Each structure stands twice: as C-alpha cells, then as structure tokens.
Design a binder for this molecule. Structure first.
Ligand SMILES: [Mg+2]
Ligand SMILES: [Mg+2]
Ligand SMILES: [Mg+2]
Ligand SMILES: [Mg+2]
Ligand SMILES: [Mg+2]
Ligand SMILES: [Mg+2]
Ligand SMILES: [Mg+2]
Ligand SMILES: [Mg+2]
Ligand SMILES: [Mg+2]
Ligand SMILES: [Mg+2]
Ligand SMILES: [Mg+2]
Ligand SMILES: [Mg+2]
Ligand SMILES: [Mg+2]
Ligand SMILES: [Mg+2]
Ligand SMILES: [Mg+2]
Lengths: 243, 98, 239, 77, 124
RNA sequence: GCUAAACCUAGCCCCAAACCCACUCCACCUUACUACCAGACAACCUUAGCCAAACCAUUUACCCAAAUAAAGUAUAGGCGAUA
RNA sequence: GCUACCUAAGAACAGCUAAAAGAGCACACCCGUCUAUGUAGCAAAAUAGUGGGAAGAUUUAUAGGUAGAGGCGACAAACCUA
RNA sequence: CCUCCGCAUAAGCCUGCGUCAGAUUAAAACACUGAACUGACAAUUAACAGCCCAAUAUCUACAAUCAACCAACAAGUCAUUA
RNA sequence: GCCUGUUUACCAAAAACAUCACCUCUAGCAUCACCAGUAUUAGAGGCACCGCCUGCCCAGUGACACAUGUUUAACGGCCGCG
RNA sequence: UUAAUUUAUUAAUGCAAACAGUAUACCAAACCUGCAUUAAAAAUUUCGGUUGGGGCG
C-alpha cells in the first residue's frame, strides 16, 4: 500500500489535528515562518549573478548555509550566530592528501551585563560577535528586542525578550514608587514596539511548553451535572409558566 | 567566528528548492577569522570628568576593553547613538551661552 | 559499575573501620594499576597526622601520655595511641617510645631555641640547628605529609628570617614557613630494609600479585642517570 | 587540617535551576500539572511538605537545641 | 535453557524470592523488628451480612411473570424522580433560592461526608 | 496391491480510492503481569563501510522539493573511472 | 552462571611422623605423566592404578564489576558459552 | 553379591512409576503392564528460611586457635548511651 | 631449573612463566583505584637465593644537562698481516 | 618500521584577541579560541614480472 500524505507533512497534520489546533494564530504563524538566519561563517554573494573568469559567461550564484551544531551551553547562555562546526579539513590545503576531520570551537568570555528593562545583572559567558552586536545596537535591551528568534539561537535570549515584552505591555511597576519619572523615561525609550499582552506571552515558548500552557488554560474541573439539571428544570418551568 | 567556504561548489538545486548537499561538501577550508585582525576603536560619549582619557563635553574614541570594563558598567560613558547625541549637543549649546 | 568508596565517615573515632580492597579497580572497573590484588584482610585505623590541635574550649599548650604501642598493617611503621585530656587520637609513634611516656604539644615560639626531647613536638622556630626531625608540614594548619614512613627523619639546615629549610631524606632541600609544627626524633620500627621476605607467601599475604611475565626490551631509559641535585622548591607565597 | 569527608561519599549538590526563574515578573511553565517527571524542559521548585497526623513509624525528633530536658552544662553518665 | 513462556509464579526463585511475590493476597498489616506481624483489625474486610429471617423472595423467578421493555437507569431519570418534585413544590409557593442547594442532597465537595463517590472510599 | 499418487481455501503482491487505530473490573517499571512511604543525575553530536577506477591513499547516484526537452550542456573530478 | 582477574560475607581438609616449616606419606578433595579399551563411542574429550598437592601461592556454595579501534593475562597471541 | 552409597540442606522446569477406563492403534530398543501415555479424581496445611528494624547526637585499641602456660605475625569474623 | 606452583580447557604440562636476593629510572605529594600512603614510600623495567665476581666504550640510537659533556646491570660491540 | 598521506588527542613552545597595574622600556599570572613544531598513538594501504615447481644465479 501507499500513504496519503508525504512523510514531511505529518508535523503539519498533527498541528492541524485537535490539541495542537487550539493554539493562537500568531504563535502558529511564528512557528511556521521558518526564515534563514544571517551569514556568519561564510561571506554571502553580492548579486544573484556573478561573472566568473576563464569564460565570459554570467552564471547565477547562491549562498548556502553551514550546518552548525548548537550545544546546550549555547541555549543556556547568550551566543551570537556561531557555534560548533563539525566539518572536514584536508592536510596541506590540497585534495591530493588526507581528508581529516576538524571541529572549531568559539571563544567564551565570562562577563557580566546589566539589563535596564529588568534591572538585574546576569553572568553570561559572552563571546565576541555578541559583544560587537550589542555595541552596534547601542545597549543590550535593543540587541535583544530587535533581533528575531532566528538570530539569538538561545532560549535565554527568547526568555529575556518575552520578559521585556511583558514588562512593556503590562505597564507593571519596574523599580519602585517615589520616583515614577525614571520608569516613565524607560517606557518612553522602548516605545517603537509595544507588543500586546495576548501575543507577548507566546514568544519564545517551545512546542511542549505551548501545549502545557494550553492544557493548563483549558483545564477546568468537570462541573457537576446537578447544576445543569436544575438550570434546565427551572428554565423549563419558567417557559411553561410564563406562557 | 571562523569564516570558511564550501568545497566542490554547490550544484544549485533550484532557486526555491532546498539545496541538496553531499558528503563531499562537508570539507571546508579556513580563509579568514575574526581574530588576528587589527581591532578598531569605538566612539563613546562620557558623562563625567575623568583623568586624561576623557572629559565632560565632547567625545573621544577609546578602546573596546576600557569601554566594556570601566566606562559602561560604571555609568561613565554612553554609546554613540543618533538619539542621545541630540540631547547632548542641546545641553552643550545651552551650557555655552552667547 | 556500582563502585562506591569505603571512606564514609566524616567524624574522627577510635574504633578501627573496616576497609575494602581494590586490586587496581577504579570507578569504571578496568585494571589500571597492575600488581595489586589478593591479600589478607586488614582493618583501617583513623590516624591523626596533625600534631598540634586545640581541644574544645582550649587554646594553650596541653600534655599527653603514651599508653600502648601497637602495629598498623596499612603502613611500614607502627602506631601508638596516646591519651590526653578528655579524648584519645591515634598519632605516629617515634623511636624509643614505650608505655608511660610524656610528650608535649606546644606552639608558643620563644626567643631562643628549646632543647626538647625526641618525643615532644615544637615549631621549627624554637629548634636548634642540626636536629633530627620528622613529620614536617607545608602550610600552617594543613597537616604533616612529608617524612612519615618508618625510620625516616630530616635535619634542619639554616634559617633566614621567616622560613626554615628542611633537608629531605632524598638529599633535596625544601623550605617552609617558620610557624609550622613538626615532630622531633626518628620514627619507630627501624631496620625495615633488613626484613628478609623469604617466600612469595609473604607477598601474597601483603596483597601484591607477581609481575608480568612478558619479556620487555629495555629502551633508552634503563641506563644510569648521573644527574645533579634539583633546585630547592619554595612553598612561601610572595606578593 | 585534613578533613575526613569525601565528596564522592557525601550527598551531591543539586543542579542549578534553569534561566526562567531569574526573570522578574515571569511565571515558569513547568510540569506540575501532568504529575510525572518530564524530559521536556521540566524541573520546578517544590515547597516543603509535612504530615498533619503523627505516625510512630515516621516520627522525626526535634534537634537538641530545644529539648525540655536540655541544659547548658554537660553531664557524665 | 530455562522456561520463558510460563508466567513468574512463586516456585521459581531461591530462598530470597519466596515471600515478596505471593499470589496477590491483600495485606492486613505490617512487620516489626522481631520477625513478627502486626495485624490491624481495621484493615481486614468485615463482611456485613444482614438477617434473613422474614425475607420472602426466592432466587429463581416463576415463568408466570410478565416481561417488560429494558431501558438504562440514567441520572436524568433519578433526578426528575427525586429532586424535581421538591423543587417544584418549593418554587410553586415562593421560597426557592438558587444560592443554597445543600438541602436537596447536593454536596459541593466530597471531603465532608465519609462515603465519597469520585475517590470511592468504600470497597464494594 | 501394499507402500502411496491429483482433488480448493485460509489467502498471498502491486494498483485507484480513502489519511488508519488504540481502558469491561483488577495487575504492568522492584524479582513488569508485585496495593501501600523521605535526595529529586538520566535526549539535544560530521554516520560509516563495501565495490569501482583491474591496487589504492582524491573520487564512487542513495541526499526523500511530481513528468519531459534542454542534457547527459556548461561544469567538478590522481581533468579519470565517474558525478 | 565454563574459563583470566578483583571484591564482601562463609565452608572444607581422617590418621601417623607432628624438627619451628608456603614439612612428608596418606581419606574425602584440586589437576591429569603413562598403558589398555572407542573414535558415527558412555562421553562434539570417558574408564583403574602407576601419579603431584592435600594447614595453604589450595578448593568451593552466594552476590557484583572489567568486552572487541577491546577485557584479562604467575606471557600459553592462552581464555572471552562446544 | 555390591555398597566409591543413601538420607537431608543449597541450586533447578514444577505434578513428571497413586487409582479408574482405553489398553484395537500409538512411545517399552521384546513381554507383563509402565519411570519414554490419553482423559477424570488430589496430594503439600508450619513451628522450617525468608517477608524485617521510628528518629536526633554520641560510644565501641588488649583477637580466634578447649584459651588457662608459653609463643607469635598474614595485625584479625560478632558489643552501646541520653 | 634454587624450591612449592602454574601455563598450551581439547595432540607438547616442559629446561616454558612466576618466586625471595640484586640492579636501573621516575615522583616534593590530600581526596573516585593508585593512597584515605609519604624518597626505609610508590610506580615503570632486566636476571632471579646463599659462595667467587660483573673488566672497557657515546664513533651510531634513545634518555639527561642544552656547560659539546653523563649514561650502557639502557639498544650493541671487545683485530689482521709479516 | 629508518615503506607512503598527516598530528586528528597530550605536555612543552612562538604568535593574535581576553584581563590589570607600570616611569620613550620591561613584567604576560588561573581558566577558554586558531595557526606551525617535537616523543605515544594512530584514520588507510601495498609488498612488480620470466624464473623447464618458487627464492637465490
Ligand atoms: Mg620484580
Ligand atoms: Mg620477565
Ligand atoms: Mg577497486
Ligand atoms: Mg592464572
Ligand atoms: Mg606441606
Ligand atoms: Mg603431600
Ligand atoms: Mg612466548
Ligand atoms: Mg621447576
Ligand atoms: Mg594440552
Ligand atoms: Mg589447566
Ligand atoms: Mg598432557
Ligand atoms: Mg625463568
Ligand atoms: Mg657487564
Ligand atoms: Mg612470480
Ligand atoms: Mg628455476
């Protein structure tokens, strides 16, 4: 026999089934977006057509990504668009020798930051590209809120983004009373986003966490049928009496 | 970040399709790394009076190490963003009157 | 591989604790050290190597009293339980130590040297030049680690201003801080090298398997190395 | 001083918590509802639990610093 | 080789296995430090047997009994037979209150009375 | 003529269509087929190799996006068996 | 679970000479130098003595660990379910 | 006539020479009927070994070998308190 | 061949491997075996007791000092003609 | 193995980024990253032809 749907559509089928179909639209769209990240370990081509030497004929060129590995240390900390590259390297840079395997490792600098939106210092083993992006984005909060989910490549970054979005949406007192001018200035500095509350709670959550949250929201202990029975009875008696 | 290029060249598996890769494409080659490069100095605007590295008023392009260590965490310098420069120059113009 | 160590006692006591042999088995189970396995059952004694130690609500010097000298199978030298105060702790015995002896564990360094006996212990800052010492420490309040076998002893060389160079039995010099407590005299159970084995039964009882029977060709490290004395290693931390 | 406590024999320290409890104003989504231990990021913090009814087979005695027969000086029996 | 298709009873293990297996018997106590059994009188199932003196009902039915249609006894029928008359009686006069319903047999929780239904405290 | 020869049905393979299911009560993570008690540690990783090039060290469709002609074209390849 | 090694708790060794003994003969026991029987046999490795040990480098009942780019090895390239 | 055997404990599938009918056919290296069988009848009842121990702190150096002479070395198999 | 013993389970059970005596090299030392040990110790190697003794060499290899050297009980070698 | 590609994993090295004092100069500590070298492992392989049977001639 044969299958009705291909093997690469079962995830979409399970999402369109029942328990995974009650998810909100924005979360499903953000999960099914799937956008390519920024080139990090390779220089992308300028134009779509490149004139190669030796022959005067134009050819279309494309920039392919590099299959990099993400260890759990990357998800725990805040890394850039790099990671572990499990590739192969020849001997003396020639294909007429031996094909050896070489795995590069990024550099880790255990530094300390200070988030202005959360007002709490965290110890994160930051690298160099992340520090460069933070310096170019003029702060850490801007680097966290501007970069999308395909740029952080870490769970802590998405958690920080979701926390900042909730803090900016709920208008909850960040610091403390007796000086609201600082909180007002902080809220005015980060005003070019302002994601609503019903959509900021589903930013960065995985599939299992989303299913757990949807089950907890749709829990509801079974109401006893006695209340429904007496309600139907009083409705029927009112309908037969008022007529 | 180590920038490497792919060997054997990608055979271009269409424009809207997924690029099919082979086991021979795993071989890379190092061309240039982010390190071993003469670093550049960033521009930071200070807010207080220090020694001979800065002064309250104008800006000075200092090193990245000093800026990340004893300038930004201690609140002695701000990034060179196009937002705070406006208020900085406004305060500088209001300070130096006619 | 459920390999758990038998060193599960965080409180010092006097009752000998039963020990489990290993035979060269770590946590994985593979033999990594050859020549160990199959021996007579032994019981471990908690030996207190730190000489000077104040009791509860104590600070000044205290007297002790040697009771009885026994034997420890875990090492070459013999041990001797010395009672004193309201507690009893096992310490390493010295030469010419019998029942009814009196030893002192002082710490106040004096202006001049102290003509102590070969049983009591005093810091190196109060000992004359040229005295056979043993059980020397490396850091103040760490514990005696060097020169602890049978009959081994060290002799004081010279003093500078806050250090004390101790001549080790390996003919190598080594300095240490002046505020280090070290015993005086030689360890008991002498003439240990003259102990004739006789048969392989003694080695099997001690727990030592015979060597490998493979004929290994001697490389370039089997020749005699006439090397000079290595330099003196310093443990004093200087800023 | 040479300690007599081995790190391999004593109780090992628990692993540190995840990076979700360090966020001020953000509740974690753990597995406290499914009532089983999960592989999916799931490890919260459980509060202490005590028994309301005393059991002779599961009775714990209080420390010595609050016994009714505890005194400041020590005797010799 | 040994057997595999047969189930694991209590006549296969050595001296260390005869005891903790059993035949599914319900325990009515525990053990102590002296190889004794502490049987609790509150753990043995007490059989409640009513009196059968003046009981005029035989276990077999006669063939002269007429048949009738079969229908399940759902909760709606029991409700409309028990609580509906009382509710109609208290509403037809003018004293029904939808705030309190504990006087009709409804219980908001099952931790008050002994014989609970959802957790099932009774055996059978 | 003794030994022994044939008597069709459980169905078996692939198409077109359709997306297919999982507690009557008890037992099932310890010695599964066990009713009842105090350290909560457990996944996130280039597949490799044979053969072929008369050996073999570079290389050798298998990579899961519907046909065909382009086209086995430019190309990659101890510029060679091949892709 | 047979066999190499290790670990924790046990058991075994009549009698005589016992020189104090990793002493001797010798029961049970550990291994098998030789003769004779068969090689589709009792047995995909047996039958009696001539054999060495038998108070210790001995044997064994129970439980656990060391596995192939390796385990182990008083080193036979010996053993890791015929 | 042999007993170099047997009875128990330890390990091991658990009903494997008790009765009844068939014993025409089927497995005894041939027979009776039964240690190479079909169905029905029910054995074994614990006192035997297990199923074990409420916590907080603290305490436990003068072996066994008739253990009393002597003598050692491979330095050792057993206990409590508020 | 010092001895007892063990090794090719299943054609060799031995002069074969091991054993105390001897010699060489390495290590200044706290928690998972080594070792809850301290240069009379531990690990890595060669022969294998007691009696007489081990005479020479760094041209070549390795090791140690980088001072042109030391090491052979480290790999190995100790004439021919008239 | 002193036959061939190479050090893929150590300890020593030199360079570059990472910290901190220092009057136009020196010092480079504990822990991560990349390049090239030295002793151990190794990821792979072959061992040509006639030879009045084969090697030797
Ligand atoms: Mg030896
Ligand atoms: Mg040898
Ligand atoms: Mg081929
Ligand atoms: Mg052996
Ligand atoms: Mg004997
Ligand atoms: Mg004998
Ligand atoms: Mg050999
Ligand atoms: Mg011999
Ligand atoms: Mg043989
Ligand atoms: Mg044998
Ligand atoms: Mg033989
Ligand atoms: Mg020999
Ligand atoms: Mg010689
Ligand atoms: Mg030929
Ligand atoms: Mg020829």
């Amino acid at each position: 026999p044969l299958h009705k749907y291909p093997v690469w559509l079962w995830k979409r089928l399970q999402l369109r089934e029942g328990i995974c179909s009650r998810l909100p639209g924005h979360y499903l769209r953000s999960l099914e977006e799937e956008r390519t990240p920024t080139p990090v370990h390779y220089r992308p081509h300028g134009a779509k057509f490149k004139i190669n030497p030796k022959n005067g004929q134009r050819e279309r060129v494309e920039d392919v990504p590099i299959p990099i590995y993400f260890p759990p240390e990357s998800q725990r900390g805040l890394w850039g668009g790099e990671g572990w590259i499990l590739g192969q390297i020849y001997a003396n840079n020639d294909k007429l020798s031996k094909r050896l395997k070489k795995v590069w490792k990024p550099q880790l600098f255990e530094r300390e930051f200070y988030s202005e939106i959360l007002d709490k210092k965290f110890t994160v083993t930051v690298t160099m590209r992340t520090l460069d992006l933070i310096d170019e984005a003029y702060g850490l909060d801007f680097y966290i809120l501007k970069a999308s989910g395909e740029d952080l490549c870490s769970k802590f970054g998405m958690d920080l983004k979701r926390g900042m979005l909730l803090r900016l949406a709920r208008q909850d007192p960040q610091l403390h009373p007796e000086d609201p001018e600082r909180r007002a200035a902080i809220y005015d500095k980060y005003k070019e986003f302002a994601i609503p509350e019903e959509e900021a709670e589903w930013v960065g959550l995985t599939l299992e966490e989303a299913i757990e949250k949807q089950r907890l929201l749709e829990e509801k202990d079974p109401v006893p049928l006695f209340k429904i029975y007496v309600a139907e009875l009083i409705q029927q008696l009112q309908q037969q009496a008022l007529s | 970040t180590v920038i490497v290029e792919r060997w054997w060249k990608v055979p271009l598996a269409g424009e809207g399709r997924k690029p099919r890769l082979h086991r021979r494409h795993r071989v890379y080659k190092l061309v240039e790394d982010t390190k071993h490069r003469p670093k550049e100095n960033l521009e930071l605007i200070l807010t207080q009076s220090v020694e001979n590295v800065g002064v309250r008023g104008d800006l000075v392009s200092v090193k990245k190490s000093l800026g990340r260590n004893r300038l930004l965490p201690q609140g002695l310098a701000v990034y060179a963003s196009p937002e705070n420069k406006k208020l900085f120059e406004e305060e500088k113009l209001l300070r130096q009157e006619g | 591989a459920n390999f758990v160590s038998w060193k599960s006692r965080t409180k010092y006591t006097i009752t000998p604790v039963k020990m489990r042999k290993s035979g060269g088995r770590d946590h994985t189970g593979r033999i990594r050290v050859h020549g160990i396995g199959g021996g007579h059952k032994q019981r471990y004694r908690m030996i207190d190597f730190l000489r000077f130690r104040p009791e509860e609500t104590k600070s000044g010097p205290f007297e002790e009293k040697v009771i009885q000298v026994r034997y420890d199978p875990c090492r070459s030298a013999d041990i001797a339980l010395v009672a004193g105060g309201s507690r009893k702790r096992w310490i390493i015995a010295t030469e010419n130590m019998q029942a009814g002896d009196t030893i002192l564990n002082s710490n106040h360094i004096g202006r001049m040297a102290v003509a102590a006996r070969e049983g009591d212990a005093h810091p190196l800052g109060a000992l004359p030049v040229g005295t056979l010492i043993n059980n020397v420490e490396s850091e103040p309040g760490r514990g005696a680690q060097y020169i602890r076998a049978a009959g081994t002893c060290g002799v004081l060389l010279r003093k500078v201003n806050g250090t004390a160079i101790i001549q080790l039995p390996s003919k190598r010099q080594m300095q240490v801080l002046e505020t280090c407590v070290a015993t005086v005299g030689r360890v008991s159970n002498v003439d240990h090298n003259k102990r004739v084995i006789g048969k392989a039964g003694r080695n099997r009882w001690l727990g030592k398997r015979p060597n490998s029977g493979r004929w290994h060709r001697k490389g370039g490290w089997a020749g005699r190395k006439i090397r000079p004395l290595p330099p003196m290693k310093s443990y004093v931390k200087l800023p | 001083a040479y300690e007599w406590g081995v790190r391999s024999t004593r109780k090992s320290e628990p692993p540190p918590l995840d990076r979700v409890y360090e966020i001020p104003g953000l509740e974690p989504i753990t597995f406290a509802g499914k009532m089983h231990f999960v592989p999916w990021l799931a490890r919260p913090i459980f509060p202490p639990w005590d028994r309301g009814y005393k059991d002779p087979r599961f009775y714990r005695s209080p420390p010595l610093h609050e016994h009714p027969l505890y005194k400041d000086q020590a005797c010799y029996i | 080789g040994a057997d595999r298709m047969s189930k694991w009873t209590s006549k296969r293990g050595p001296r260390s296995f005869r005891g903790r297996k059993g035949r599914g018997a319900k325990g009515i106590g525990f053990l102590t430090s002296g190889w004794r059994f502490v049987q609790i009188k509150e753990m043995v199932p007490e059989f409640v047997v009513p009196d059968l003196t003046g009981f005029k009902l035989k276990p077999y039915v006669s063939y002269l009994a007429p048949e009738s249609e079969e229908t399940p006894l759902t909760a709606a029928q029991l409700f409309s037979e028990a609580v509906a008359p009382a509710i109609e009686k208290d509403f037809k006069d003018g004293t029904f209150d939808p705030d309190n319903l504990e006087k009709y047999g409804f219980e908001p929780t099952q931790e008050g009375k002994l014989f609970q239904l959802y957790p099932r405290n009774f055996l059978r």
